[PDB]
Structure formats: C-alpha cells, structure tokens
Amino acid sequence: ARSAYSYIREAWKRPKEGQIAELMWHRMQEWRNEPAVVRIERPTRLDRARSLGYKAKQGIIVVRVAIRKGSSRRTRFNKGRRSKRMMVNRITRKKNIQRIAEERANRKFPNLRVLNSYSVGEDGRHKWHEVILIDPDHPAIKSDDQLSWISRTRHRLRTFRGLTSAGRRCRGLRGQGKGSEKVRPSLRVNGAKA
C-alpha cells in the first residue's frame, strides 16, 4: 500500500494546488521575515529529504536558504570591450540558484558537509531550498554504514568543489554518452567548454 510519505510527495507535485497551496501562502510570510540561513528541526519535505539521504539522527542537520531570483547581478565594464562583451542584463551565472544556496548554507556551518538539497518553493523574488548537512565528526554518523562515506578526508568541502548532487548535474555530468564530451571527467580538464 501507499506509504504516508507518498502523500507528501504527491502534494509537492502541484505546490500551487490544494492545501499545500495554502500552507505556502502562510509560511512564505514567516519565511520572508527570517534570515538567509535558518536551521530547522524538521524538513518541510520529509519524503524528499529521506529520499535524498536524510535520517532522524544525531549529526544530521537541515536548513532553509533564501537566494534572490533572476540573472546575474553584474557590473558594467569600466574599460575597453568589444560589443559582444559589453553585455550586462542578459548575462546569467553558470551556477544555478540551488547551488548557491547549498554553499551559503555550507559556509554558515563550517564543520558540516553538504549531503544534498531540494527546493521548497519561491515567491516573486526569493527562491528557497532546504539543505541537508552532515557532521562528519559526530560518531553515530562515523558509525553509520550508509553515511560514514562523507566522513572521509577526501570529502572536505564537497559543495565548493561541485561534488554535490546539484553540483554534478549543473556540471553537465548527467549523461554518460552523447553530449558529455567536454563534460566528463571534469570541465576544467576539458578546457572549460561545457
């Protein structure tokens, strides 16, 4: 039979419909009154979190992040430039908003490592994502067989290196075949043409 979770999931398929529609209109008011990075006791999308690797365990933290919407907040050239590069308004960053969030959340927690993340909506100018972060030093995590991999030294500052969930997707690493020529094994190693 359907898991209770299956219902949360189901409501977040159409966030502008039914009850969740009214919850958002509610929360988003308290959300806009909160800081950029706010730690929360429980994920607003439980199926989503658990699906991403979340557990109700010591050493596991979740947080909401607000980032501005739109393109790049870019300054106009102060020196010579050819028309092609005189651009400002239509320049958009190459790192999606979800990925900025994950980072701002990570910095707020210097000892923690990003496990994954998910969007929790947006209004006219914010974009919210909740980020799951793990304490790689807390035993209970060091002793958990499904998370202890994040404890490894080789994982220090995952987000900042794009080893995150959205990190790899944004890096054009989804497909294993056609289209990932200049993507795999790394953008930089591919002359940065993807």
Partner 1 sequence: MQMPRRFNTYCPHCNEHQEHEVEKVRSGRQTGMKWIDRQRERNSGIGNDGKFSKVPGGDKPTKKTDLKYRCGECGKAHLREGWRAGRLEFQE
Could you list the residues that contact Na ion (CB under 5 A)?
106, 110, 112, 194
Gap between the Cα atoms of 115 and 168, Å rounded: 13
CA-nearest of 42, 40, 34, 32 to 69 is 32
Cis geometry, peptide bond prior to residue 43 (ω within 30 degrees of 0) = no
We find the least distance from the C-beta atom of residue 97 to partner 1, in angstroms, to be: 22
User: Segment near RNA (CB under 7 A), from 37-45, 59-67, 118-126, 130-138?
Assistant: 118-126
Number of H helices, E strands in the chain: 6, 4
Structure token digits, residue 90: 């239509």
Gap between the Cα atoms of 40 and 62, Å rounded: 6
We find the least distance from the C-beta atom of residue 192 to Mg ion, in angstroms, to be: 11
User: Segment near RNA (CB under 7 A), from 34-42, 57-65, 133-141, 179-187?
Assistant: 179-187
Q: Which residues bind RNA (CB under 7 A)?
A: 1-6, 16, 25, 28-29, 32, 47, 50-51, 53, 55, 68-71, 76-77, 79-84, 86-90, 123-125, 145-146, 153-157, 160-163, 168, 173-178, 181-182, 184-186, 189, 191-193
Q: Which residues bind Mg ion (CB under 5 A)?
A: 189
